Amino acid sequence: MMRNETRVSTTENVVNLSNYEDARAKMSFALDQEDWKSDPSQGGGIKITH
Amino acid sequence: EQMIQSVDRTAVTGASYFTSVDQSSVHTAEVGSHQIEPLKTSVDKPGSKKTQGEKFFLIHSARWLTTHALFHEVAKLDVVKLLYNEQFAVQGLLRYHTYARFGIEIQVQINPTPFQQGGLICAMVPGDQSYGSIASLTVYPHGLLNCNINNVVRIKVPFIYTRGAYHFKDPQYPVWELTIRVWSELNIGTGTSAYTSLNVLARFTDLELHGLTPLS
Amino acid sequence: EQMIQSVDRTAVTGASYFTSVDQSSVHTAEVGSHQIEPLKTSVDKPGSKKTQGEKFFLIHSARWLTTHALFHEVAKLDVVKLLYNEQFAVQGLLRYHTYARFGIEIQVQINPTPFQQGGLICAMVPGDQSYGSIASLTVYPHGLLNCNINNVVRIKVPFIYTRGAYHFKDPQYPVWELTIRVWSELNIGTGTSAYTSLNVLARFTDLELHGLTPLS
Amino acid sequence: VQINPTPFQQGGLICAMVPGDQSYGSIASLTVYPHGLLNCNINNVVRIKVPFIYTR
Amino acid sequence: FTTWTSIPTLAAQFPFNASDSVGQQIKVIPVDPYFFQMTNTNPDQKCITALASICQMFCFWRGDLVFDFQVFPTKYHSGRLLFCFVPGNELIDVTGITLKQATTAPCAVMDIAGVQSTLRFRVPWISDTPYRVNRYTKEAHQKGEYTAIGKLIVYCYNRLTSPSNVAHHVRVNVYLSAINLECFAPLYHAMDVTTQ
Amino acid sequence: DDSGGFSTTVSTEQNVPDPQVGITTMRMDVSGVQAPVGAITTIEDPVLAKKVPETFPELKPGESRHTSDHMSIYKFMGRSHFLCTFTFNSNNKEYTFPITLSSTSNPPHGLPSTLRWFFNLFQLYRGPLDLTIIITGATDVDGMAWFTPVGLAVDTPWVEKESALQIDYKTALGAVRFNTRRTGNIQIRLPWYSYLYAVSGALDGLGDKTDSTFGLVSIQIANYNHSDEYLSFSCYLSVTEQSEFYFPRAPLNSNAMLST
Amino acid sequence: FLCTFTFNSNNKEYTFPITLSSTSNPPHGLPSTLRWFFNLFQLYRGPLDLTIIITGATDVDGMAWFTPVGLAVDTPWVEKESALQIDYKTALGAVRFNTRRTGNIQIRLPWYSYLYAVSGALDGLGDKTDSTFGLVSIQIANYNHSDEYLSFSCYLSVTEQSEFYFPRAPLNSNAMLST
């Protein structure tokens, strides 16, 4: 006898775009959910983050 | 060089509920002291709230006949309202105060000759004689009279009410409501007297008063 | 073999001054208990004899003029008799009791403008305003008023009487007799108001009651 | 604030420091502000010290 | 919110004339935090106390109120007043109470002259219900629900004796504040001037 | 003694609250060899009234099979019951129903079948409740509901009419918002906001119109209508563990138990 | 409660500011409860908490965004056409919703202002500058088919990040207006 109930709150199926935590994806086109490593081989080590 | 002591002017002096704030006062000048009496002129304990407030009072009586049918109501009285009257000694405290919180003691007395038969019921009911069944009055704090066994019952009850205290000069609704029903009919033969008297006694328990008012 | 416990019949049960000697009684059957209130509905201390009996009462006033001559008597009042009245809160205890033993507190209040001049005297006299000299009233417990110094005096006195206790519903003779004489005449100029009011306050101290009576 | 009454008179005043505006606030409740009460019976000098309250 | 309620603001205003007899009733006050009567003409506005603009947003209230009477005399007047508190509700017949009959109720006297000029008067909580309801939203009356714990009376205990070159009346301001206050059950309601 | 009196005859404690666990369980003959002293007694003595009777040789019954017990109030009245139902007819029509514990107000205006029987078994009720409503009928209807304590200004009870209060007075008391297409159910608590101590069931006079009602629920609808479909509501109550009960009372007779 | 408004035709953009002024009488400004509350003190600082409720027709696509003060945006309190491109709208961050699916948005509002803190009661040019701190606008699409009214409502709150400063004399009876 399973017992799991959840009340559906307000603002259902609303897309937020302002921050990153609600803009990120839920599923991927990529196979096997793979990830990419770093490769600073042709940039000469110059990487910009600010 | 001397130091001259003077009169005291500004202090909190007087009784408890009459605060005499004065900018000019004087030291109390009164002679003698409180002497005791070695030859006493009254051998009873002096009066107070304990000997005046809590004392059995005769508030109402009725009379039980042979002609009353089954489940007839002999006496229907308000316990709290009949105590509030000038002819009793408890009027002298309740007239000048406003709110009270209290408990009720009840005593019922009858006197049957042993030629008769029957019984009664005396139940203290709070608030209302509402749609509750007459056949189930024994759930309430009651006492059963019987012409074979006993002639005196007594009931003690705590305070049951929906507010903080009772208001004498403007009651909301009566707190307690005593009731006496004919539990079984009275049967006599020839020449036996066809009646017996009834009496109701009452008093307070744990009387607490608040907020004395000047209005009569 | 068993032992059957039974009902209790003959004992001294009831209130203190109402002794219910019964040949048939029952055990008290009452439910619940006395609960306290964590959210109180009245923040004052409850009523008792201490907060109702001993409290300053306004019993009589007079008014002091410019036209009263020397040694004229402004107010002549009985202290004990004026306290015994329905309009005060002390009636609720003294009406149902018979004998009492007590002490008297007195407070006198006047209000002069500083353009005037004069004085008074307020002496508590026991029993009688007899042939004693008016010029020697300062032997009695008194207090001197003056339009330069002070406007409130107070007097505390013990119990002085020739019997055991006072009898309210049939007094023998008045115990205390307050008196107020013009100690010096009141003088004004032009346009200054020619009068000032007076007030007398009173209360009991150490009230002791004996022997409650049923008669009104 | 300094005033000088003769002792034949009677009355009083109020001196409240108000920031920004004499806006729709009630006149009867000016005692919430840092104020001082003058009176022809008691005193004739009051003083008020206040910090800096501004939006820039 | 107690930053607003624990600060006294002006509520009422009444004079004390020199032509009153001893025992004349000057001013009656129903005891509630909803009471205010001052107003102004320029601009057109009905003034409010700080205590009334907190308790006008709640269904229930409870606690002791603190009346502060401030006199403005000269140094040369004299007289005594008698403040009296009658327990009850906002509607009883209160002007039949004589001056001697007022001493049964809890009372206090005040001397006009001196170096003090303020009487702080703390009213106890005397009621039969734990909370006292707000009714001014409704329109009809009903026995049992009320807005007050009783009323207050201001008597004349001694007359005003004065010289000629001073005035003939002393005005008294009436403040209003609370202590140990509690409210709950919010709503919205705008009050109106109680015209006594 | 507190009163300084005297008593040898005793009227003992009567109607002991919650005397026995109502499941048939154990804590060998129960009755047997010893002669029954409980077979004969006197009922007018409150001392001797609480003695356990026996007359025949018996023994222990055993244990029940179902786990939980069905004789406790918090598990009996945890099941919801019926309160009222009503319909709408036009646009913006506000409706208001009070929760009234009176024994005088006959249904449909008052407590129906089960709740009328339950709330008259005792004297005093205190504590919150638990309200569930069910929307049945048309779709695409916007609604709003709010709660008002007693002794405050609100519309007339049991009368479907226009709204007489502004939007500022409604939303200050706290409200909800729902659409009939999305949810179709609201499961809401009800607070205990009252100045008096506790409401009571059975009273007379002016005490019935004052000390019975403690809550008041009203529902306003919008965007109604398009082509006429009935919009029927229902309202179901319950009880919560915060609530309390006081002073047991004689039950109602057969004629008081009415139904819808 | 804060405000409410309706739509009438296609692509009509609407804009309402959050204004703490005591001068702007309702419906344009603070209604009953919030007008009373934000004039009990001098300075307000911190974020808010905004909830809106869609009532009425279905199958309507909407989009809402936030603009700080002192930047270019459409006229307040006027329902009209859109005058800004799609690049300027989405750069500030926006949402997306359909009236058939959700019917509610519970959104935060940031505190983006160059000045220290806004104030309630001012006069002169200080009222039009130092009162408003936020500005919310809503654009709808796919409206309409056969005419059904699309009514919005807007409800405010307060958050624990926000602050309050300098207690103030309360408003009189005549300032407390209602809708």
Residue numbers in the entry:
A (entry chain C): 1 to 50
B (entry chain B), C (entry chain B): 5 to 220
D (entry chain B): 112 to 167
E (entry chain C): 51 to 246
F (entry chain A): 3 to 29, 40 to 272
G (entry chain A): 94 to 272
Which lines from the publication concern this structure?
report the characterization of 4 highly potent NAbs: F4, F6, F7, and F9. The structures of these 5 complexes are almost indistinguishable. that these NAbs prevent HAV attachment to the permissive 2BS cell surface. binds to the BC loop of VP2 and the BC loop of VP3.
